Design a binder for this molecule. Structure first.
Ligand SMILES: [Ca+2]
Ligand SMILES: [Ca+2]
Ligand SMILES: [Zn+2]
Lengths: 361, 263, 157
């Protein structure tokens, strides 16, 4: 009676209750059972008739669209790209909501339930022709890196912790995390969006221990990271292939995606073998298949070509099968003595495959 | 379209028009906003409810640079990541709500000692009567040269008076609410008697390296004070217009000096 | 940064005042000159198109460098010769004609991850030695997804 805005929590409710229910039930008996949409549109009309189109336009922006407040992906991105912990983020959230009345940041459970779309292991896919020794479930995130290596007082003692994904899981998650880029490339190169030809992906790998990352008579520890990055995507169209995806900066820091990491050495050969051999098993497995998953509308297919390159010099002398660094045979590509390079300088060629080193072993 | 619901629901137009005309007499704006707000509140989507309450309340999008400073320092953020957060909410929202760093430094040097005027009615011998003096070295002109005694301790300090006037000015709404709540006016002079307790403590080692393993034990110690009780004697008696609810916290021990030595 | 800073022509100008002989002056001038003439091929991300004039020089510009390394400096490069020189001397153009670029396919991209690993261990942790790398991996992945960095690069109208 004083005003609706001077009225309390249900004061306005019991004041205009009969008018409220009569026009609401008249509307949902009129327009097929919805009152909110028709009521909002008539409120926009009734406000914007009074030369106040600014609030009407921002309201039409924020309902059925974007505007004030933030999408959860935005607040996740700005949480992670400042490395802020959760608790201080919560404090920032609660004081912003306390000051401005609005709700611009999101709460934390709403953060995680938008996070789970961005790990590996969310989206369905089909390996065809399927992969031996590979569990076919598509709900795989973190598993332990030991592959359940039985470890008790009678066996070999192990001391390391390693966490990893599977290879195909992180691979499809990285593929779906660039749908905007590949669709942009197909739009810009005068192609059709409805094309599910067999794309070819070329992927770089990398592995270099990051020793002495210890924290406190000072005894250290080391750690090895194994990582990869999508590098070039093309598609054989007609009689030629054409790039949909190159990279601006290949060796960037913010475009090198992890795959596995361990608290071990680069020289303790045993634990390094016993951890990395599942990964090389999967890597050998998916070199003879196609991949099928839904990429924004139509499902598409994939093949692969790998180039393990980002090993330094010492590691590739240590895992491919050469001796230590101070040898006489020096070039990891050709086969010449160190003493030979002093006489003849520049006349060799690359002559070291992988299977050749297998048969030489 | 615009015209489709206008013709299909002109019945609702004339209905709520005349019904606001006959209930309280013609405030179609207010009843229509409350009815749409009740329509959307019922959906349990209350974020839109108080967003609409904010926009039709006429609330401001951006905020104080002062509260920006408080939220900056209570998360321990560098200026760089603050610039990241500022530019991303600018580019995303379209309107700017967090504030750039000019305003942060400008609201900052409001709060430091050395911005306000102040005076002493006795002239304070050996005290520099300059009021624009904040952070200076604690060495007070000590020679650490090769002809002198060797010292190494790095000292940072204010003066005692400027910190005192700053720590008295920042609690201004506390003392005003003490004047209102304990039945006095604003226009009451002092003299206010101020109970200041003081403290000083070493903190152990404060460093760690990575390079040559075993680092050194850098010992450190700060000197500090606390405003805890503001009293005023008016009339016949005195009245404690500020009592500190907890003097031994980590929010109410303002520092004076820092030095890197042993106790 | 030290590696880039030490390679100036002016550093050769600086060391020339500490050595007497003209022979050593012109030798070191030609040395650093040829090394800077041959640097950007293996250094860039797309040298087949970006600096492609120095591509076809590289055989000639390497052979003369090797020969004046032999004759003028047989005091040191007569027996032992370090292997990186053999790599940067005799295997670059075969690789480039094989594989396009070089400096794309580098280990630069991961070795700078030390700061990310250390900071993630420090500030976002639970300290239980089994989750304590799990959340590190989760945050490290959540960093490097491109769908989020597109949002962070929004200020690019
Ligand atoms: Ca290494
Ligand atoms: Ca390294
Ligand atoms: Zn060779």
């Amino acid at each position: 009676r004083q005003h609706l805005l001077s009225l309390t929590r249900r004061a306005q409710k019991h004041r205009l209750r009969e008018l409220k229910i009569q026009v609401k039930e008249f509307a949902d008996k009129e327009e097929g059972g919805d009152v909110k949409a028709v009521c909002l549109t008539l409120f926009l009309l009734a406000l914007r008739a009074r030369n106040e189109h600014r609030q009407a336009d921002e309201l039409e922006a924020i309902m059925q669209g974007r505007g004030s407040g933030l999408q959860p992906a935005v607040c996740l991105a700005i949480r992670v790209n400042t490395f802020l912990s959760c608790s201080q983020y919560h404090k920032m959230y609660r004081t912003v909501k306390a000051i401005t009345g609005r709700q611009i940041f999101q709460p934390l459970h709403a953060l995680r339930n938008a996070e789970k779309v961005l790990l590996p292991g969310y989206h369905p896919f089909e390996w065809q022709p399927p992969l031996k020794n590979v569990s076919s479930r598509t709900d795989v995130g973190i598993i332990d890196g030991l592959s359940g290596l039985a470890s008790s007082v009678d066996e070999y003692p192990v001391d390391t912790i390693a966490k990893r994904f599977r290879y195909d899981s992180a691979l499809v998650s990285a593929l779906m995390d660039m749908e905007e880029d590949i669709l942009e490339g197909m739009r810009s190169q005068d192609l059709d969006d409805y094309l599910n030809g067999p794309f070819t992906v070329v992927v770089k790998e990398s592995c270099d221990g990051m020793g002495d990352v210890s924290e406190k008579p000072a005894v250290p520890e080391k750690a090895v990271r194994f990582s990869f990055t999508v590098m070039r995507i093309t598609i054989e169209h007609g009689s030629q292939n054409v790039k949909v995806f190159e990279e601006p900066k290949p060796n960037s820091e913010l475009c090198c995606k992890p795959l596995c990491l361990m608290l071990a050495d680069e020289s303790d050969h045993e634990t390094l073998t016993a951890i990395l051999s599942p990964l090389i098993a999967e890597r050998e497995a998916m070199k003879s298949s196609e991949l099928t998953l839904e990429m924004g509308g139509i499902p598409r297919t994939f093949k692969f070509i790998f180039r393990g390159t980002g090993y330094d010099e010492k590691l590739v002398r240590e895992v491919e099968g050469l001796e230590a660094s101070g040898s006489v045979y020096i070039c990891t590509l050709c086969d010449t003595t160190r003493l030979e390079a002093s006489q003849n300088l520049v006349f060799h060629s690359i002559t070291r495959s992988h299977a050749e080193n297998l048969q030489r072993y | 379209t615009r015209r489709a619901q206008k013709h299909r629901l002109r019945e609702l137009k004339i209905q709520v028009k005349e019904f606001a005309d006959k209930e309280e007499g013609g405030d179609v704006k207010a009843v229509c906003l409350t009815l749409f707000l009740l329509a959307l509140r019922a959906r349990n989507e209350h974020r839109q409810a108080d967003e609409l309450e904010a926009i039709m309340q006429g609330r401001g999008s951006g905020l104080q640079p002062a509260v920006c400073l408080a939220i900056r320092v209570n998360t321990f953020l560098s200026c760089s990541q603050y610039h990241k957060m500022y530019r991303t909410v600018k580019a995303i929202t379209g309107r700017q709500i967090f504030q750039p760093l000019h305003a942060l430094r400008n609201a900052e040097k409001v709060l430091l000692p050395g911005y306000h005027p102040f005076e002493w009615q006795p002239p304070l011998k050996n005290v520099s009567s300059r009021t624009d003096v904040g952070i200076i070295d604690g060495l007070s002109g000590l020679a650490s040269s090769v002809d002198e005694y060797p010292v190494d301790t790095i000292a940072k300090r204010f003066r005692y008076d400027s910190a005192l006037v700053s720590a008295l000015m920042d609690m201004e709404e506390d003392i005003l609410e003490g004047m209102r709540s304990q039945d006095l006016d604003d226009y009451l002079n002092g003299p206010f008697t101020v109970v200041v307790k003081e403290s000083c403590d070493g903190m152990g080692d404060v460093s760690e390296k990575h390079g040559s393993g075993p680092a050194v034990p850098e010992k450190a110690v700060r000197f500090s004070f606390t405003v805890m009780r503001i009293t005023i004697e008016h009339g016949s008696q005195n009245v404690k217009v500020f009592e500190e609810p907890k003097p031994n916290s980590e929010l109410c021990c303002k520092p004076l000096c820092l030095m890197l030595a042993d106790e | 940064n030290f590696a880039r800073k030490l390679m100036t022509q002016e550093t050769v100008d600086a060391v020339c005042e500490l050595i007497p002989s003209e022979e050593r002056h012109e030798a070191l001038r030609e040395l650093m000159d040829l090394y800077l003439k041959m640097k950007p091929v293996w250094r860039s991300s797309c040298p087949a198109k970006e600096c492609p004039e120095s591509l076809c020089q590289y055989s000639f510009n390497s052979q003369r460098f090797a020969e004046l390394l032999s004759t003028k400096f047989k005091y040191r490069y007569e027996g032992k010769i370090t292997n990186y020189f053999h790599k940067t001397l005799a295997h670059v153009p075969e690789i480039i004609e094989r594989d396009g670029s070089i400096g794309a396919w580098a280990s630069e991209g991961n070795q700078s991850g030390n700061k990310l690993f250390r900071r993630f261990r420090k500030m976002n942790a639970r300290q239980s030695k089994c989750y304590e790398m799990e959340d590190v991996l989760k945050h490290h992945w959540l960093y490097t997804s491109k769908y989020l960095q597109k949002f962070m690069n929004a200020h690019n109208a």
